[PDB]
Structures are given as structure tokens and as C-alpha cells.
């Protein structure tokens, strides 16, 4: 089968992150399921295995009480809670599946793992995005080309596309990833080349559009007078 | 190093790869001079194996 | 933690690559079976081997999976253009009261060749200037590989605050492109003559200034 997590989510540095574990069909309330991390720049942990069948939370010695996942047998879907998030949970987790065997081993092997939900924590939360436009000027302009764009600064979270006349420009279009800021803010860039005829007969928008804050602003460029 | 006026080792080329062993022994810290120079001796070590 | 592994290793694309996995003597070498997994930056990992002795469904017979004594190794014939991965140790650990992975190799010796990069200096607009805030932006594009160290002057001392530096993405072209920015405030954006970015490229170091009066 296949079990599929939900997508990104980003909290609060003190709050409760409440995520779940679908699966697709049956052969859930059979097996154990645990939960296995992996974060960037370390190892995989492990925090716990659940059984669904009777109900044992099997957890390790590294982990202290501070996460519970429970589990539910009428719609097979799997529930992780966790509170009093730190500053390096930032973090991935996965739907693992425990099928025991015999033999002189006799070690826990994922067989089967889920999708992934990337859970982010940090500073700098929500607020609105700004948008800057970008003209080109006459030095800058050499050839018969000329690059200009939107510049997107104080927003969060990820992540947001960027469209050009509501994805009718394709040509020569390019999105910039973003960066960490000191403040713990993300920025980036989309610049796309045009021919110089087309400077005075035909505008350009940028589109920005944000799912989690729900904040659609569109901003119209329009080029420099003096330079 | 150009910022740091010590003598630091980073090119660690003794081997590639070692895939099974059984011995492993750890023996007394001993501290070492990294700066090497162009004048006379002043220590005599002798080792025999 | 308790299991160490090699940071990366080096390889041919025809002979034989092995790999080693050591830990201590009562969670790999007590009795407890070996299992190697893929991670893929990019997808979800999945099972390939499960006690060194059976093969799942779904994975080629290449990997070979033994245990000698207190180390585990994995050996591999051939690389084909899939094994641009890490590669783990996942065994249970009774000190530990549950399982724990390694540390990871790397198996990637390069394929990055050069070129000549191109830079793009652009001054802040003027509605910019009223959010009391001045984002100096320099957008690098055509270049490879994606390997550029940013710098920034103004005529007098290099700046050392407010640097960043994203990392480089794929083009359609096969090419990679970057922008840094700078956070400066209006009030001294206006007191210095000029500002520019200074990247270098190999030896190649282009430079682009600009005049805000």
C-alpha cells in the first residue's frame, strides 16, 4: 500500500504541532508504526513506534515526555502531537511501518515509509509581503535586451510562486530561490530578458500570490525617467 | 592559514578505506610542534621495533 | 551517536566500491541483523536490503550485504546514474532501547565543469527608499559550476555585514544563477560615493559599480 502525511507547516517557537498519517487501503491495524525523523546535517532518529491494534506507546530514552502520537482504529489514520517546540526541530518526519520476522536477528526493518511532512520552527512569523518593482536604465542597457523584474522582501512563509501576466510570459523567465536571513527571514528574485522594443507598448505585472496568509497583491514596473 | 599564525595539519593522506578490523588501542596524549624551521637540532629520539 | 561511518568515498564507474560500518559490540555485533537504506535528496527513502540474506522485491541484485564479525559491509558493482545518494547504517541498539541510524556517505567524486560568469548590479528604486530600508541587490547568471564568493566594497573598506548568499539553481540551459542582497538603511545609502559587488570565478573577478547621484 501507500500512506500519504500532509504538506508543509510552519509554528510557533512554544506552541502545539498537531500533524497526522493517512493510509490508502487496509494493512494498518496489523502492524506497528513508528516515526522517523531526519534533519540536515545529522543522522536519522527515532522517536517511537506505535501498535494500533492494542495500544502500547513505545517510546525511547533519548526522547523525554514531551510528544504523544496517537492512533486510531475506525479510519486507520495515525495522529502525531507535539509541544514546546525548540529551535532545532526544523526537521522532517516520516510514516514508517514495522514486519517483524524470525531469525537470530530479529531487528526492526521499514519496509514501508510514508511521504514526508516538513515541520519548520523559527522567528519572524507571518506578516504581510512587499513587493518592489525593478526598471532598467539607459547604462545598464548596452544591447537590444534589458532585464528587469520583481523583488519580494518581508514575507513569510514558504512557499510563494511567482507568475508574469498570469503565466503568459514563459521565455526567458527565472525564479530565484530564498536565503536565510539574521532575523530569520527569507527574500527572492525573478528577472526576465526582453527585447527594448517592447519597453513602451507593452506592460509587465508581477503576480504574487500566497497560500498560508492568503494576501494576492499584484504591482505593475514602469521604467525610470531620469536614468 | 593566512588569518591564524599557527601551523595547523588538514591534509590527512595516510589511507583510503579499511572494512574490518578487531584491534583498536588508544595510547597517552603527547603534544607536538607543528612549526617546522631551517636551524639546528636540539632533541635525539631513537626507536626501536 | 554510537555508529560512525566515513564522511565520503571515492569510486570508478565500472569496478567494485565498498563500504564499512562500524559500531560497537552490543547493538551490531551482539547478534542483531544489518539494515542499509538510500537517501535521496528528493523523495522518501525505501528498503533495499533487510538481514543481509533476502532480497526484496523491487531491487536489483547488484548490492551484496554480509556481516563480518562486529562490522557490517555493502559492496556494489558498477555505478549507473542513480547513486547520487547517502548510504546509512540502521541497526537496533539495546543501550539505546530502540533503533538508531549512522552517519551517511556521500558518493559523488564531481561533474562540475567551468565557464565564464556574467554579474548584474542594480541599485535600489526610489519607492524602496521610504520603507526605511536599502536592499542592494547582485544577481550572478550564466556561470558553472555554481561555486561564487560574494564580496561587497565601498571605495574605502569591505563590508562584512549584511552579506548573504543563496545557493545556485539549475537553468533550462544547463546553467546555474544567484543573487545576494545587502540590508542597508537610506540614511547612510546616500553618504558614500558608490557601492559594488566583487565576485571571483577561478581567477576571474568581474566588477560592476553603481552612482546614486
Known amino acids: 500500500v501507500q500512506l500519504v502525511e500532509s504538506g508543509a507547516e510552519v509554528k510557533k517557537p512554544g506552541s502545539s504541532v498537531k500533524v497526522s498519517c493517512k493510509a490508502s487501503?487496509?494493512?494498518?491495524?496489523?502492524?506497528?508504526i513508528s516515526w522517523v525523523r531526519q534533519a540536515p546535517g545529522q543522522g536519522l532518529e527515532w522517536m517511537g513506534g506505535?501498535?494500533?491494534?492494542?495500544?502500547?506507546?513505545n517510546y525511547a530514552q533519548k526522547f523525554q515526555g514531551r510528544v504523544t502520537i496517537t492512533a486510531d482504529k475506525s479510519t486507520s489514520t495515525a495522529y502525531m502531537e507535539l509541544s514546546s517546540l525548540r529551535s532545532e526541530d526544523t526537521a522532517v518526519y516520516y510514516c514508517?511501518?514495522?514486519?517483524?520476522?524470525?531469525?537470530?536477528?530479529?531487528?526492526?526493518?521499514?519496509?514501508?515509509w510514508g511521504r514526508g511532512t516538513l515541520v519548520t520552527v523559527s522567528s519572524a512569523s507571518t506578516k504581510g509581503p512587499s513587493v518592489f518593482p525593478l526598471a532598467p536604465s539607459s547604462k545598464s542597457t548596452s544591447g537590444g535586451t534589458a532585464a528587469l523584474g520583481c523583488l519580494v522582501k518581508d514575507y513569510f512563509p514558504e512557499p510563494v510562486t511567482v507568475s508574469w501576466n498570469s503565466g503568459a510570459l514563459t521565455s526567458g523567465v527565472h525564479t530565484f530561490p530564498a536565503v536565510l536571513q539574521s532575523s530569520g527571514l527569507y527574500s527572492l528574485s525573478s528577472v526576465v530578458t526582453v527585447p527594448s522594443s517592447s519597453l513602451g507598448t507593452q506592460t509587465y505585472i508581477c503576480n504574487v500570490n500566497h497560500k498560508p496568509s492568503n494576501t494576492k497583491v499584484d504591482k505593475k514596473v514602469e521604467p525610470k525617467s531620469c536614468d | 592559514h593566512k588569518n591564524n599564525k599557527s601551523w595547523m595539519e588538514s591534509e590527512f593522506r595516510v589511507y583510503s578505506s579499511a572494512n574490518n578490523c578487531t584491534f583498536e588501542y588508544v595510547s597517552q596524549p603527547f603534544l607536538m610542534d607543528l612549526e617546522g624551521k631551517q636551524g639546528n637540532f636540539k632533541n635525539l629520539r631513537e626507536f626501536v621495533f | 551517536s554510537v555508529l560512525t561511518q566515513p564522511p565520503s568515498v571515492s569510486g570508478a564507474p565500472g569496478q567494485r566500491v565498498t563500504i564499512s560500518c562500524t559500531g560497537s559490540?552490543?547493538?551490531?555485533?551482539?547478534?542483531?541483523?544489518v539494515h542499509w537504506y538510500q537517501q535521496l535528496p528528493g523523495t522518501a527513502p525505501k528498503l533495499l536490503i533487510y538481514?543481509?540474506?533476502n532480497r526484496p522485491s523491487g531491487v536489483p541484485d547488484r548490492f551484496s550485504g554480509s556481516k563480518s564479525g562486529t562490522s557490517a559491509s555493502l559492496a556494489i558493482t558498477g555505478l549507473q546514474a542513480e547513486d547520487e545518494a547517502d548510504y546509512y547504517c540502521?541497526?537496533?541498539?539495546?543501550?539505546?532501547?530502540?533503533?538508531?541510524f549512522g552517519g551517511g556517505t556521500k558518493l559523488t567524486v564531481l561533474g562540475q565543469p567551468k565557464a565564464a560568469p556574467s554579474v548584474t548590479l542594480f541599485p535600489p528604486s526610489s519607492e524602496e527608499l521610504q520603507a526605511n530600508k536599502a536592499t542592494l541587490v547582485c544577481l550572478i547568471s550564466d556561470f558553472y559550476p555554481g561555486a561564487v564568493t560574494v564580496a561587497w566594497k565601498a571605495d574605502s573598506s569591505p563590508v562584512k555585514a549584511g552579506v548573504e548568499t543563496t545557493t545556485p539553481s539549475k537553468q533550462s540551459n544547463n546553467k546555474y544563477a544567484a543573487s545576494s542582497y545587502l540590508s542597508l538603511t537610506p540614511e547612510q545609502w546616500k553618504s558614500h560615493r558608490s557601492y559594488s559587488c566583487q565576485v571571483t570565478h577561478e581567477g576571474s573577478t568581474v566588477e560592476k559599480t553603481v552612482a546614486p547621484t
Open positions: 514508517a511501518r514495522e514486519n517483524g520476522y524470525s531469525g537470530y536477528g530479529a531487528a526492526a526493518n521499514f519496509d514501508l
Open positions: 487501503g487496509g494493512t494498518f491495524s496489523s502492524y506497528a
Open positions: 506505535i501498535i494500533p491494534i492494542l495500544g502500547i506507546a
Open positions: 559490540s552490543s547493538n551490531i555485533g551482539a547478534g542483531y541483523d
Open positions: 538481514g543481509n540474506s
Open positions: 540502521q541497526s537496533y541498539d539495546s543501550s539505546l532501547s530502540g533503533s538508531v
